[PDB]
Amino acid sequence: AYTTFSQTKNDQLKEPMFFGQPVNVARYDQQKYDIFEKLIEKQLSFFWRPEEVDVSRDRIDYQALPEHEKHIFISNLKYQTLLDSIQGRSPNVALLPLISIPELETWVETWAFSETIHSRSYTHIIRNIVNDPSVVFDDIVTNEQIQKRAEGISSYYDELIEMTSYWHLLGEGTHTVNGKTVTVSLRELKKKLYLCLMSVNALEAIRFYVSFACSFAFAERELMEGNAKIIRLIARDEALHLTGTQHMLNLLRSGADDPEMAEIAEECKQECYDLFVQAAQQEKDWADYLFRDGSMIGLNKDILCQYVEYITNIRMQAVGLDLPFQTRSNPIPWINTWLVSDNVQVAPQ
Amino acid sequence: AYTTFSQTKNDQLKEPMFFGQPVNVARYDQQKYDIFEKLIEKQLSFFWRPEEVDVSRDRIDYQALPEHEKHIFISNLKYQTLLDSIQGRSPNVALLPLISIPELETWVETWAFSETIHSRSYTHIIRNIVNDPSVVFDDIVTNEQIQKRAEGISSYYDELIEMTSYWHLLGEGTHTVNGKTVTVSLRELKKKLYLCLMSVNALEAIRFYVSFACSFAFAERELMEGNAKIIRLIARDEALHLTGTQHMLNLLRSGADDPEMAEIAEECKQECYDLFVQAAQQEKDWADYLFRDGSMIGLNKDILCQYVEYITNIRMQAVGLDLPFQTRSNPIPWINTWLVSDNVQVAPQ
């Protein structure tokens, strides 16, 4: 049921964001939602290449770090690489076959592409600070703590992709597959999508910002400054990405785009709340792993956990969910130095 | 046999440094050895008061330190306080009753006094960086690691003092005390003194310099800068003190002052070698205690142990002993910044 060029001449201004007629002609003279056109333009203006940044000095700083500080830095580096290894391919694979307006389609491709720059930038950093990069890259797959977060995050994508394939192949209804019952419901599929986006919003708006704090904390000590130059650029992008999903989510639940989605979004408003909280807690437990062997000047388990609650409360309200944590001010106000850009608001407000 | 004013009119230019006729008139128009007069003048010009130094910011830095870095800093602080608690009283109590030339007598009093300024300066630092100073001061006595070094160092003083009292009270020979044999030998007493001085030389020329490295390493990170201002002044003094004992030791073994001492110094040249090595090793094991919970930027067990071997080799040659360690250059050349003074060579050469 999916076609790379649907032959029907539809009015793309009146198509839903998702599950409508697949996009035929890619045109940018008009939009249903101009936010996605604005994101594309912003992302394109932000285009950067990793090797523009000298990370040489960072090798010296890294070697001079005490073991536990090495542990902190590299564990964080490995987590980021994992998250954007997923963000590199997944928006394309999971969302493209479902999008039905051109501006959203292009934004997703631009988004995913910008993630591949992020993944490349980690390779730039890793090769430059360790002797054998294979050890690091191999740990990313077999590290028990990292692996746990990978499995959870990738499942929201995988379940959406698999249910999508059934839908394209079988259409809605109840079917017989090798003598088993496979029930295809557009309503269920719409739900898998909504949760996936909520999940991805948490990934980019919370999980990554928790990681940025660890990076900039090094930069505050005037260490790993090349890495921090790069994280600044990544963070500036990340602010575009999370804005993207905040608008998809908010447009979906408002009923403005698709009325059935508004109902579905309320049906699982609890599930999304729970999803977010599970992410916030997983990041708190991650803080535990980072600082198991000790902390450093300016950052520790306690402080980072406060930032998690802080940042979580902000992202959740932005997508119309209830705050799960005590109202708290920013525990690390110095981070906003690093989360700055004259073209987009990187720092959470 | 000791008198605070011996009634004999002796020529103080021809008295031995030690064990001669107790000093009667304190005069400074003439010296046997002008080095001690030069030390006195230098020490007096160096006179400083602890409270001249603002250590306020150091409270903030201390609180911000990770636990293991707190452990490093305070363990080191506690060790210094112990060493100079001993250096405060011991040169006076152990050496005064034995000195027989005025310039040496005054130098020792000036020396011991300057140590009381050091002890006072630690109280200044401690009160300012912790909430309850009693915890710190109480740990200094009951800390198993510190306690070990205290016992060894204080025994060289105590055995000299006790043997001195017998000598003053009984004079040389073989005696009957409560039905026991107490043999008083000036030759033995001269030996207790020589070893004590060797021990004290190690204390000031090695043990304390190992400690200075820990302090300045913090200052290199731009932390605990008030403490480091103070350590700079203490170190400048310490260079005078170790110079004092290097000349007593070297004058004693050269036979220039007392011919019997030259023999005794060769009789136990092995014992002194061993003494020094035991001190160097104890400081290496101390490095282990400091960094048991992790190290910090610029200083760790390995690096500090190299400095111990380095500094030990230098001090030992200065007192005519064989080097126990491989010839090595300075592992922490940055320390010489802090060990500077235009009036005396603080940094080891």
UniProtKB/Swiss-Prot annotation, chains A, B:
Which UniProt keywords are listed? Deoxyribonucleotide synthesis, Iron, Metal-binding, Oxidoreductase
SUPFAM superfamilies recorded for this chain?
Ferritin-like
The protein's organism comes out as Escherichia coli O157:H7
Recite the UniProt cofactor note for this protein.
Binds 2 iron ions per subunit.
Q: Which reaction does it catalyse?
A: a 2'-deoxyribonucleoside 5'-diphosphate + [thioredoxin]-disulfide + H2O = a ribonucleoside 5'-diphosphate + [thioredoxin]-dithiol
> What does the function comment of this entry state?
Provides the precursors necessary for DNA synthesis. Catalyzes the biosynthesis of deoxyribonucleotides from the corresponding ribonucleotides. R2 contains the tyrosyl radical required for catalysis.
Q: Which PANTHER family match?
A: RIBONUCLEOSIDE-DIPHOSPHATE REDUCTASE SMALL CHAIN, RIBONUCLEOSIDE-DIPHOSPHATE REDUCTASE SUBUNIT M2
> Which positions in this protein are listed as binding Fe cation 1?
D84, E115, H118
Q: Where is the active site?
A: Y122
Q: List the disulfide bonds in this chain.
A: none
InterPro entries in alphabetical order: Ferritin-like_SF, RNR-like, RNR_small, RNR_small_AS, RNR_small_fam
Listed under subunit, the entry gives:
Tetramer of two alpha (R1) and two beta (R2) subunits. The B1 protein is a dimer of alpha subunits. A radical transfer pathway occurs between Tyr-122 of R2 and R1.
Put simply, this protein is called Ribonucleoside-diphosphate reductase 1 subunit beta
Is the Metal-binding keyword given for this protein?
Answer: yes
GO BP: deoxyribonucleotide biosynthetic process
